[PDB]
Point group: D2
Chain length 421, copies 4
């Protein structure tokens, strides 16, 4: 119903505060189930995926308490139904993150098996085999992953991920924290959300070492004592606002972030002709009104260029000077945004997993449709440098991946407004 | 929005009547814009894409005279607004078919540039380039393809398609019908709907030779007179009901159709172990209660295996004996239905354009979700064999590509029912 | 140990005669095995693959009249051995073309199963299956395809090609020419050499209709009598010399050719900036000293852009102005020539089946290596516009696909010389 | 003209063999001797043609090595004359590009022939150049040579980020940074074991390399690197090949002088195939107990994921396994030459893009085949052990480049293989 009308031309200039990592808050909220008492999770971003995670906890019997804005107190001792119903899992496949801790703490779980997702192929085979490696008897029946740990809880084991998985590493890490004995995860996801999740379990009395590297070692404990924690900054949001400034040729000082969690993104911004300055908890980018130069990029697991920034750089190459090759290795058909940009005058040829972008002088305003919680931000970025008005429909997707995108751009001098239907 | 509830286990047996081709009716209806008098189009299918095309004519000032048993009289001389609004084109990209004949008959047209489509990469550069080859000056602005022909009208020319395009051939074919001089379409699409359009334009007075081969030659004319013309049978609908019998191990006679327009589909049904007989206007498949045998297939332009039948054969391979390799060369990442079938207990490994389907003995009923007008029929087909109830949501997609799917399956003895919201 | 030493910088200018189609001569020669009397093939190109095909006839016991250069007389009635040995088949996989006619004419054959080729995936499964569909029992043993036709010869049948195959269509076409009754080749290869093969078999008394279209209906005959037929002109050779003049900015009049067998290639040369003029059997190209413009291309089955010209246009894009996207669909990783051009200063990024060629002002001479009988001609072309000398090694590959390439370039004024050792 | 291999299948393997030094570690370690200014001794070198080729490259530069003791080659780069890696040797081995980094950092300049094409797939070297340019070295590709020239005062350290994981790419910049003034930080670096072994070799010569093994390597430059005796690590690819050799035949084998931690992905896939495996400080013991292997799915990727050098070997395993398995290549998407040679031996393998859908059969049939890949062609030797009758493999000069006398080791396990010079 809600829409965003954006008038291009405006040069961005200002500073905004970054929200907590969406992909760190979800696994940490799921990790609260491992605790044996009330746990307060701070620096949460005000976006819909956090709200869907709160509903899920409601459906299970847990009643979250908001002591302050961007903060939730979770008490897992009031849990009644060990079920992640399909009515909610169908809306957010990240709900599967509850499977691991729920099985390792309470002994069983019935999580709905995720269906299809527009982005591409996103099976959860590794999530299931990882829990089986720890003795759990799992079966897919009636659309649910009916898991049940063996008597005496889960057992520690050496499990190898054939493919690097972020949420896969997270489920098995959480389960390994309460399993009996030592668990060793091989070819683990090295994303900072994983590290931030480990630091949460360790704060609670967990024995996790290796997070950040390909080999995570977990020494099981019988019970994780409650302890408060503040979620890390969102590396994707941070990057998205740096590109917003870059695309428009203006400047921005992104605050409350971390420069060490997006080296690849900052390095691509320098190749495009941007000047970057950084502090301990802030980043400052300034193009000085220069038309960027096309850059090539290849998505891959962290610390490589993240796929959640792939779309954002296509909107940069769209008005750049020269040809840029934006390649996908994670999700090879994540280019819906490209076909919407065609309407705005962007010249891009997509062949398989590669998007060849030919930079034109400027874009043209046209009504577009959002369809990806992170990639559709590129439509918001392209609209900022498009002659005329750009009406972006189906923004509920954008609301899932970004905290008040309209308000943050308005502080940077952007001419953008929300239009409720 | 409505839903479809299906109880599997029943072995289908009966006979139905095939409707008019959706992909033939769409260009044939668009082709009525070329007429210089009232034209009647028969055997139209009762599905939503046709309803959207009628609305498109409504926007342009034409008020199609619908009648009982699906017949539409169109007098294009009452046209008023030479525009195909984005509000209608965003719901169906096949609306671009009006560009060609509208530029050739009236000298100008403003048709919204199609946006993104979940299926995959579907650009329209060849549509635009083909009209540019005939002297028309085109420019993309405000999200619209603003086409203008010269004073004398469109001039015939030799145009070569770099990629085989069904709707591309149709647009350029229709434009060349009123153009001055001969036009030769090289590397043209050979689909039977292209031939059916050619024969429709010939009934109106046109002179189109070669339709159905790699080269189409058009000797342009001044005007096109009235004509009454029934469209061809739908080959995808025909193939879909043949699989419905094959998955359930039953029989089905398909009336009012044509066996010559789907030799590839019938051949893959022989490999699966199906007994097939054909007549002048009918096809009869009968599995004799046998479990299907796995089959490997590869989608390609007609007469190769059609991409619109790719999903239906995955349903067939899901309960087949052995492993089957289902490959896509047209829409490489068109496998959303595979992840929905995972919920029903199917075992399919998807890697890029290949779907390795490992057949199991039985599927399990569970709530699924449709997303593709033709491919989502596979979910209905998988539900016919699965154990228990299968609740299919978002059936408006199915209602676009198939004429009352529940009423036809009901004649074959299937437990299927429409449940409104 | 032969090598070509080219000195770049010369602007080509002249005219040359095109040889007979190499890929038409091979199957037409193989078709002579079907005959029941002396058959003479004319207009043969003097290249190694024809020599290798003649050695095979020698090993089979046939003593062909090799008096004349451009023609050969063959009497299959004097055959002594129904075998295509591994010693020869390993050097040329096109040797499999003798399988079909040998099985149909002599009731059995044992042809070595081709091994790997550095180009890409080239299995011969459609060849084996097509013969099996005609009632022939076939097994693979000792690295040989041992086929055996039933008593009364092969039976005609409807056979569907899952993938468009040139040599596949040619084998089943030849076998069906002597089979009992009608045969229907569904989704046949439309390449001009298949048409040239059909007309040859028809000249011997056969009845092959639909050659050049997607469906070929062959009515088998009992005996194929003598005929004196001249093969068609080589379309790939034509295109290579047209590019030779296009890269050097010169001109060239190609004689004894046909413009209708390479419309896709002629169209891409116009998009590059070359002025083309044609006739019944000639094609004249002239760049008039202009630097070409970058062009995109997609290889596919004829009449689409041929894969045997994909490398030739990569050298053209190297010297071109702008970025050119060269895409492969037949052999998705046939880019060895690209990595050889990096040595000559060419800026080409390769990702899967797509080559992003970024044009530069000039190439630098350096010793390179040939690996493909058709694509390595691009190394010879790049050397024409490279500064200094370019020493090409392993030219035996080029001698297979081109009739004394240096002598024809000498006619056009190119500084090219052959030096053994 | 050249050697061949004749293999008679059916024999169940049983025995033990000693693993040689890592080819891909011995190659960069030898090139790293150029950084030193003294008599550096390198032990445990494998006897394979590529080590001989690297020695020839040193000879053309004026550095003839002296063998101190068995398998211990002592190199002293102070006697170097010419700073050029000729095309005549680089065209035969593209790994020769590894001398560029150290030759530029120590001596100031270098001319290394730009490698051409490799049948395996797309293997450009743009990151090797981009990394040296990030350290101030001006480079140009003229006459087919990478004419690199460092600025006065040596190379300057820099924070270079690899857009794609490159093993040899990570090694060249690591060696260059070893002597470059200032700190160098390689981001998204290759995590392969040979990178770690190389880092420990440079540290043994007085270097300062941290984070080798992890995706972030920090290097601190020094004035010079003194002499030190060092032994190269075991070859993980050789280890895996012989573990499959025992597995395809339903037999067993103990692998000595190796390391299980350097091929976890390989050992897990063998357990999924139904192989009983035991490990220790420096050995691996596998035994199929005569059971037919189970079909397994694979996905090649940068270490520690399943290595692409082991992809071909597991196809020969699936070729005779129970069920259908998918072998996927993310690195070299068209590295399947061996598959078409396996078809000749009776294997059922459908290739589409980078996926090899292997459907297993009771057994293979012997047939003459041809090798064309220094590592992947070992699969032809493996599939020949389970092929009825004789199998004549040709162009084995490729196999000699990546394996130390493959016939004498299979003969130690009881395999009916023999080398035929005819
Ligand atoms: C799109 C989002 O961000 C995504 C982000 O794009 C991806 C990749 O960086 O990693 C997270 O997803 P994820 O954990 O489901 O994805 P991953 O598991 O890393 O998948 C990577 C690759 O591994 C494959 N994969 C994954 C899991 C599995 O069991 N098997 C498997 O084969 C997938 O096919 C995919 O191609 C983020 N989501 C969360 C909740 O952490 C989002 O916020 O929803
Ligand atoms: C999905 C539908 O059916 C589809 C059917 O799947 C396909 C393939 O057979 O051909 C029709 O689409 P279409 O005309 O857009 O498809 P094609 O034009 O043949 O596209 C084939 C390929 O060519 C490429 N392509 C197409 C047009 C173009 O200008 N440029 C281009 O590069 C596309 O990327 C695609 O990969 C049907 N639609 C209609 C209205 O005729 C539907 O009912 O909407
Ligand atoms: C390389 C040469 O030219 C080639 C030329 O590149 C191609 C494409 O037009 O068609 C001929 O090969 P071919 O007939 O072996 O190749 P095709 O059969 O067309 O193969 C096309 C595609 O179909 C697939 N294919 C073909 C046959 C088969 O049984 N199975 C199969 O999967 C292949 O994987 C390939 O990707 C020419 N050769 C001859 C002797 O006619 C040469 O000079 O030998
Ligand atoms: C085949 C051999 O082993 C190979 C082994 O297969 C590969 C992969 O693990 O890593 C080494 O090659 P390499 O270092 O040249 O390969 P990598 O640099 O890792 O290349 C991996 C991928 O990165 C890409 N790549 C690499 C470098 C570069 O500058 N740009 C680039 O795009 C390539 O296209 C390739 O697809 C081994 N060789 C040596 C001497 O260390 C051999 O012994 O020759
Ligand atoms: C993808 C984004 O999955 P999700 O919505 O997060 O469950 C989708 O549905 O498109
Ligand atoms: C695809 C299915 O195209 P269309 O609806 O026909 O415009 C989509 O939009 O998802
Ligand atoms: C390719 C070109 O196949 P062929 O020689 O024609 O059998 C090769 O072997 O390199
Ligand atoms: C590959 C293997 O590279 P190299 O020979 O090692 O330079 C090849 O040439 O095929
Ligand atoms: Cl697609
Ligand atoms: Cl590991
Ligand atoms: Mg969703
Ligand atoms: Mg739609
Ligand atoms: Mg060859
Ligand atoms: Mg080589």
């Amino acid at each position: 119903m809600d829409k965003l009308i954006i008038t291009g031309g405006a040069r961005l200039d200002g500073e905004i505060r970054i929200s907590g990592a969406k992909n760190a808050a979800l696994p940490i909220l799921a990790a609260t189930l491992l605790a044996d008492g009330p746990v307060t999770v701070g620096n949460l971003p005000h976006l819909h995926d956090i709200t869907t995670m709160i509903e899920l906890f409601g459906r299970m019997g847990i009643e979250p308490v908001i002591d302050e804005k961007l903060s939730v107190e979770i008490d897992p001792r009031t849990i009644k139904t060990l079920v992640a119903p399909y009515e909610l899992v169908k809306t957010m496949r990240a709900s599967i993150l509850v499977l691991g801790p729920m099985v390792a703490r309470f002994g069983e779980a019935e999580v709905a098996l995720p269906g299809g997702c527009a982005i591409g192929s996103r099976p959860v085979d590794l999530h299931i085999r990882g829990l089986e490696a720890m003795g759990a008897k799992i079966e897919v029946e009636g659309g649910y992953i009916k898991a049940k740990a063996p008597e005496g809880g889960l057992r520690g084991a050496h499990f190898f991920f054939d493919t690097v998985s972020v949420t896969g590493t997270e489920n098995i890490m959480m389960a390994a924290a309460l399993a009996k004995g030592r668990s060793v995860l091989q070819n683990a996801a090295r994303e900072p959300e994983v590290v931030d999740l480990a630091n949460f379990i360790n704060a609670m009395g967990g024995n996790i070492q290796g997070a950040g590297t390909d080999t995570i070692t977990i020494d099981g404990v019988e019970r994780l004592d409650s302890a408060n924690y503040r979620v890390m900054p969102d590396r994707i949001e941070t990057g998205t606002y740096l590109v917003a400034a870059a695309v428009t040729g203006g400047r921005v000082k992104v605050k409350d972030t971390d420069p060490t969690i997006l080296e690849a993104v900052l390095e691509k911004l320098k190749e495009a002709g941007a000047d970057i300055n950084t502090g301990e908890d802030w980043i400052e980018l300034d193009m000085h009104g220069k038309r960027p130069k096309a850059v090539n990029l290849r998505t891959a697991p962290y610390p490589a260029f993240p796929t959640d920034m792939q779309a954002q750089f296509i909107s940069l190459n769209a008005i750049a000077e020269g040809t840029g090759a934006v390649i996908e290795t994670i999700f090879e058909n994540r280019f819906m945004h490209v076909y919407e940009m065609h309407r705005m005058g962007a010249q891009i040829q997509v062949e398989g997993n590669t998007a060849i972008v030919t930079g034109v002088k400027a874009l043209k305003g046209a009504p577009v449709m959002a369809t990806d919680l992170r990639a559709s931000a590129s439509l918001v970025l392209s609209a900022l440098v498009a002659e005329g008005d750009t009406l972006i429909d189906r923004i509920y997707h954008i609301d899932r991946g970004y905290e008040c995108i309209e308000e943050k751009l308005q502080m940077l001098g952007a001419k953008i407004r929300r239009v409720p239907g």
